[PDB]
């Protein structure tokens, strides 16, 4: 037996998928990603860490 008293555990669900073919509507599509995946925004939080 194992006892974990006080430790925050983050358990990943993982990719709950089946590798099955999924048909797509290719007729007309577009892509528009934002800065979120880079976190370089929020007012350029790397230099703008201090605002005072």
């Amino acid at each position: 037996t194992n006892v974990v008293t006080n430790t925050p555990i983050d358990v990943c669900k993982g990719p709950d998928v089946d590798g099955t073919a999924d048909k797509i509507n290719d007729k007309k599509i577009h892509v528009s990603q934002g800065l979120k995946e880079f976190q370089v925004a929020k007012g350029d939080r790397v230099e703008n860490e201090i605002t005072e």
Binding site: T1, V3, V4, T5, N6
Partner: peptide, 9 residues
Amino acid sequence: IGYNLAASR
């Protein structure tokens, strides 16, 4: 016999 391992963060 028992075997109880434990540790806090």
